[model samples]
Target: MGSSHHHHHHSSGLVPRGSHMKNIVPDYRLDMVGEPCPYPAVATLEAMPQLKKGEILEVVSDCPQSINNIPLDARNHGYTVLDIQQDGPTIRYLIQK
Candidate 1:
């Protein structure tokens, strides 16, 4: 007679959002490997407006200065910086709009 801890079961099929990931590849490519600082960074911003919403961008640059400039500049402009990979002397940036 002391079983007063019974709980009512609730079951509703809830559709949860925001569980998707992996746009593993980029939709646009900007190769700035040998291009100088501010140029690659500049072109990056110039090209951002062209991409559709949620499109990923790949930018390959080698300028040592780009490691700092590109990502910072891109983020400042409200673009999402997905990743930055370095292969030898080149740096690859994965950005999304």
Candidate 2:
């Protein structure tokens, strides 16, 4: 994946406006490694709504609890699970609004 950072055209996701690192090149990426379960869920909840109606977000976390809870919480909140790319203990969280 590329080190990506882009502004919105309405149909876009949001990061911290200009943040970058590694292992992520999606529309938007959240690094939640070593974070807790509900924290990731809450983070996703807070971030996803800030995006466009059909945008995608990627959240990465090593927490096992969040590994499953994130997507489930997203669905409960009426978001679409676009894609989930998992590597080792980390996850590339993908959801569409």
Candidate 3:
């Protein structure tokens, strides 16, 4: 969200609930490129809760399953999931805790 988040909402109907990345960058971002499902999920869960409430995190992964899994994990743990953007083979998760 470094640029446009001027408007947001999607199929799942989940709006962007976290701070935008305009000058509102994620407090933490974990890159999971070349990694797989659970590890991306694992590292996300591990780092997510560490953020203060209302803080944001961005997790980047090329894992197919992570596209779904990370969001699933975020929802399962009651985090305010933000955006899911795909670029080539990568899936990026924007989450708020």
Candidate 4:
């Protein structure tokens, strides 16, 4: 059983933003834009457990610390990283779990 009970003022966990990129159509997407450090990483960790095995999670964050933290955390958790793309300050991560 999973614990998912935190709905207060736009607190819907991991809601979709829209569609996907031309190539990566992730099963779920987490946009952490403007969120500070640890939030991105923590959100990512929280979100990953909700994914079905082999499902891909596309995370877009502007946290400068995420460039190193996200990927490493994903791998350490036994997730498969498909790609990591950087565009200016934003980093997009494609992690399959």
Candidate 5:
């Protein structure tokens, strides 16, 4: 398997005009910080149809099950999971439709 890794820093609007922003901004942001199993994936599934084709959804979850489940679910639905990254205890996923 081939993996591409990237690190991004959040910047304020006052920064220079040409500053690089994160490559993918999810059409929807699902944050399941305190939720339990199934909620994250379930929420993502519910929101999937609302997005336009080719738009990416950035999912942020702390639930372990979601970290494992969301990508699989996205794959099953014919969407492409562009990348997954873990920042401390949070898992962030970028899914392209």
Candidate 6:
């Protein structure tokens, strides 16, 4: 079952790297920086249904829990979690729904 509520934020507004130079445009972009445990994972889970099939979502989180929680949760929900890369404190995950 999917949730009734959905949260959608414009990635361009959230992370602006100029209008024409944005290399990757994910269907959804989640920035979970400064959030505590479970929030990152829970938010991602809640937002999963918002994505269309074959569309990718880029999850950028600084939360330690997200390093494992995000990918694990996505997989449990039958979504495909691809390319998990970490840059210092940030963990980036590409998830396809």
Which one wins by lDDT: 1 or 5?
Answer: 1
Give the alpha carbon lDDT tens digit for every residue of 1-97 in model 5.
5365745588657656675555443566665553545665564566566655446666666764543456655665555455677877667776766
Please write out the lDDT profile of model 3 over residues 1-97, one tens digit for every residue: 4587556665554568686545543565666663534665564566555655456767676765543556666576666555677777677767764
Positional deviation of residue 2's Cα in model 1 after best superposition, in angstroms: 83
Residue 51 of model 5, lDDT score: 56
lDDT of 4 at 94: 69
Worst 10 residues of 2 by lDDT: 19-28
Candidate 1 residue-wise lDDT, 1-97, digit = tens: 5588777598766777786544643555667664544665675576567655566666766766644456656677776555677777767777775
Which ranges of candidate 6 are over 4 A from the true structure? 1-25, 34-38, 41-53, 64-66
RMSD of each: 10.4, 14.2, 15.7, 14.1, 15.9, 15.5
Whole-model lDDT, model 2 = 0.59
Question: Per-residue lDDT for 24-96 in model 6, tens only?
Answer: 4356666666344566556456656765544566667676554455666667666655557777767776665
State the lDDT at 86 in candidate 1. 77
- Residue 12 in model 1: lDDT: 66
TM-score of 5: 0.49
User: Which is the better candidate, 2 or 5, if ranked by TM-score?
Assistant: 5
Tell me the tens digit of each residue's lDDT in model 2 across 8-97. 577645567454534332345566664544665675566556655446666666666544556666676676555567777566666755
lDDT agreement of model 6 with the native: 0.61
Instruction: Note the residue pairs that clash in candidate 3.
Output: none
For model 4, the run of ten residues with the poorest summed lDDT: 19-28
Q: Total clashing residue pairs per candidate?
A: 0, 0, 0, 1, 1, 0
Residue 31 of candidate 4: its Cα lDDT?
A: 67
- The lDDT leader among the candidates is 1
| Pairs of residues clashing in candidate 1 | none
- Model 4 lDDT tens row, 31-58: 6663545655564466556655446666
Candidates' lDDT values, in order? 0.63, 0.59, 0.61, 0.59, 0.60, 0.61
Off by over 4 Å in 2: 1-28, 34-37, 47-51, 65-67
**Candidate 4 residue pairs that clash:** 54-97
